Subunit: 198 residues, 4 copies
């Protein structure tokens, strides 16, 4: 049974970049609903599968991807942020960034471009392509999860759904992006990056 | 050259169902940006077309549909609302509603279901199917316009993008839907409906 | 554990409308492959679900919809055809056709249009809308099944993937569509329709 | 005003890898039809744009992408093949292949996999990423063109729509893929690649 993970920090630990109201609603309501909805959908799929009901299985895909993706994306997102985040990585991750995007600053501009470029709801991602053995930026619509839909391993995700910033920044997503860089938990992004080595 | 249409009423004319802050941002920022962006995209398409650059034409489709759809959807949305709206239609529109959905109340439940059911950004619509000669409910993702993508003629649209309600109702879209019924401008929906007769 | 259903007739029974070579390849290769692939994908989804691996479940969705839909669609298709078929349906089904589409010929033109209009691979369908209690025509891309993706109950399906007609009709899909009316098993379509009333 | 390009060789010049019947139908029917359809759709878009009819412009998008992409993709495809082709590329292109994919054989396996993996109609492509300055393999659905929908520059394309191989290879697409390597015009792929450096 899937469960809602506790936030790694208090709801106001990211102020003033992302206000506590946002953090509380985003976690206790948005992520919470996805988890309960996911459990309900998985239950239905096990029944449809046991009866070999392919039509039911197909009809349940949108709900499974949306609530499942919602759980996957937010679980990673929380760890991607930290009160002591910000600045830039150091070591292998940093070297990969410069290698694949030219410079950290260039990388920031590219991931920002992908995030701001999302038309409708979605996420901007910095991922790792195991096949190519390099970093790659990608954008996903709605709650479609990065690995489940592209195969790329998620390192850093930026939620550009309006509920992730509208209460504080309104229609100006670029202001939201500019601010979030101040809280990126590079220690966690680095750990996720190294996990792809082994 | 496309232009931003004036709101048929003041920004606070729909209180308390949709607060004035929402109305001002939604109109002066969201709809406004779409119009200017549309004009810019149309300019680019005329050039690509003149040079017979099919690749450019294809690359510009997402922007044309999104900003074009944005202009189309919001232009209709404003007229779909009114300070003196609410209640239910009377005459042919009402008879069609009962005929195709059983009862006005049933119709309200169905269009609400379609609107609340949107995963991600989108719109709920009550449209007219000229081919079948009857009413039909449909949901569209992001800014995809109803007639341009489904052929159905738009009668009543419900914006379920989070920017349309988050500041007032937060994550609870159902509360937003319940409230919007109080401001539906049935006079305009009826006019749009009759225009399909001729 | 899904199995390939025996065809209701001999591979050359639909001659000369759909030749024996196509019938044999379509059943023994295309449909058979979807069946084998479906059993494999379902087994993997069983493992994913039991492990609570949401990423794997999501990654399996395209294969499940593609191969499962393949099994669903062709199973119905075989029963929708007959060597002693053709002509027109009678009783209630025919009444509905005239009611919902105007006449039998208008219905044919509409289903043909939807079928010839498919860009890429897909299917044309005559389905029943349980919510609206009336007939409805629809087109589905690739192997996306009617009920699983639209909620509509399938009554008559027309496979417009190129393997359904190329060997005999080459690029002229309209010729295939004209010929298939000669083998439509209205007895079966009627059963599916009446099974909707109950 | 777009025109159908003459084939660079005789219809039976690619025998026995791709037979003459397929080559003739593919060029004179499939590609020719896309050209005619494209000119028609572009003319309608010219009228829509001049009128400021955003709904019509949006409604024309599927036809424009489908027929325009058809023109783009096949035009490149013809030049990607040759009767005296086959073997392997040399110089820089070959260097990049080993660099980006490991070896020529690994590249072949990867392009083949992407091509055989297309569910429904589509294309497998070897393209150049100008942003990352490296080779990249990608698959496109139906006639969606590489550059117009992915920004990648097309170097080598493989049509996996069933009309590209069914008459000769029937359902065994892998056999088609194996055979096509014998007629790849590496001279042309090289030109497209070098044209990316400048
Ligand atoms: Mn979120
Ligand atoms: Mn809006
Ligand atoms: Mn088939
Ligand atoms: Mn082709």
């Amino acid at each position: 049974k899937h469960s809602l993970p506790d936030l790694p920090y208090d709801y106001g630990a990211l102020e003033p970049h992302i206000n506590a109201q946002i953090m509380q609603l985003h976690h206790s309501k948005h992520h919470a609903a996805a988890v309960n909805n996911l459990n309900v959908t998985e239950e239905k799929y096990q029944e449809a599968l046991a009866k070999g009901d392919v039509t039911a299985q197909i009809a349940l895909q949108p709900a499974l991807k949306f609530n499942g993706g919602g759980h996957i994306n937010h679980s990673i997102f929380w760890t991607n942020l930290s009160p002591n985040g910000g600045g830039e990585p150091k070591g292998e991750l940093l070297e990969a960034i410069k290698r694949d995007f030219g410079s950290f600053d260039k990388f920031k501009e590219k991931l920002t471009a992908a995030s701001v470029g999302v038309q409708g709801s979605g996420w901007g991602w910095l991922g790792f392509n195991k096949e190519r053995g390099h970093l790659q930026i990608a954008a996903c619509p709605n709650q479609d999860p990065l690995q489940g839909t592209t195969g790329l391993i998620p390192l850093l995700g930026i939620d550009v759904w309006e509920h992730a910033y509208y209460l504080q920044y309104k229609n100006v997503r670029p202001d939201y992006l500019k601010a979030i860089w101040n809280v990126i938990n590079w220690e966690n992004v680095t750990e996720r990056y190294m996990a792809c080595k082994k």
